[PDB]
């Protein structure tokens, strides 16, 4: 998943 | 037992400024992401935008179109989440949901507030 | 962005029967970004299945998902009255997190 699709981690 | 409460919907001029709240109970409501999801009449589900958690770095995503308008903020504090709502648009009359982000590998959105109506109309 | 293509519009069935939705997407999903959700008449929706085939917390044995790549599908076994309902299927691996336009579970006569 793409960083800004993820809310779940620090990008 | 998990609860999100939604406030402060309500009638609103296009190109003014509203807040939402969502009240959260019943979780450790800092280590989650908060995502806003909206529903316009007669219509279905749109994403709106999350915040991380603070140790996530606590930044949000939007899509375009509410990016540069809306904006998403926490206050862990008081268990708040919150969609501060810019230059409205007659286009963002819909119910406000309020959820939470799923922790681990599959981010769904485990449990929804009961909605906020925010009409937009001159 | 993935555009979720649900079908059919309307499934018309009794109570008892089985129910199977689908879900399209534009392209390829990885089964575990992809999410099913009832909203029951006047109400706010709720998570049914989340990583395409797990079940949410509370969530009745009849309700099964299945699917990868850009086939998915929600199956109801056995309809009950309270499962008359829109289902809308999600995909949250690709930003925007996109919904499908969603499927009625409508009572036939």
């Known amino acids: 998943a793409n960083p800004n699709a993820n809310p779940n981690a620090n990008p | 037992e998990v609860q999100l409460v939604e406030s402060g919907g309500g009638l609103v001029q296009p190109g003014r400024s509203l807040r939402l709240s969502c009240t959260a109970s019943?979780?450790?409501?800092?280590?989650?992401?908060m995502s806003w999801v909206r529903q316009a009449p007669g219509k279905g589900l749109e994403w709106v935008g999350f915040?991380?958690?603070?140790?996530?770095?606590?930044?949000?995503e939007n899509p375009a179109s509410v990016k540069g308008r809306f904006t998403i903020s926490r206050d862990d504090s008081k268990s708040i989440a919150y969609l501060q709502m810019n230059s409205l648009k007659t286009e963002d009359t819909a119910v406000y949901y309020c959820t939470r982000v799923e922790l681990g590998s599959s981010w769904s959105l485990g449990y929804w507030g009961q909605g906020t109506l925010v009409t937009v109309s001159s | 962005e993935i555009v979720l293509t649900q079908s059919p519009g309307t499934l018309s069935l009794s109570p008892g029967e089985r129910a199977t939705l689908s879900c399209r997407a534009s392209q390829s999903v990885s089964s575990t970004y992809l999410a099913w959700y009832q909203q029951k008449p006047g109400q706010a929706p709720r998570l049914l299945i989340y990583?395409?085939?797990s079940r949410a917390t509370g969530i009745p044995d009849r309700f099964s998902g299945s699917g990868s790549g850009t086939d998915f599908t929600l199956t109801i076994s056995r309809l009950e009255p309270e499962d008359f309902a829109v289902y809308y299927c999600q995909q949250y691996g690709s930003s925007p997190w996109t919904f499908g336009q969603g499927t009625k579970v409508e009572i036939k006569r």
């Open positions: 019943g979780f450790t409501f800092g280590d989650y992401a």
């Open positions: 990583g395409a085939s």
């Open positions: 915040i991380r958690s603070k140790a996530n770095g606590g930044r949000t």
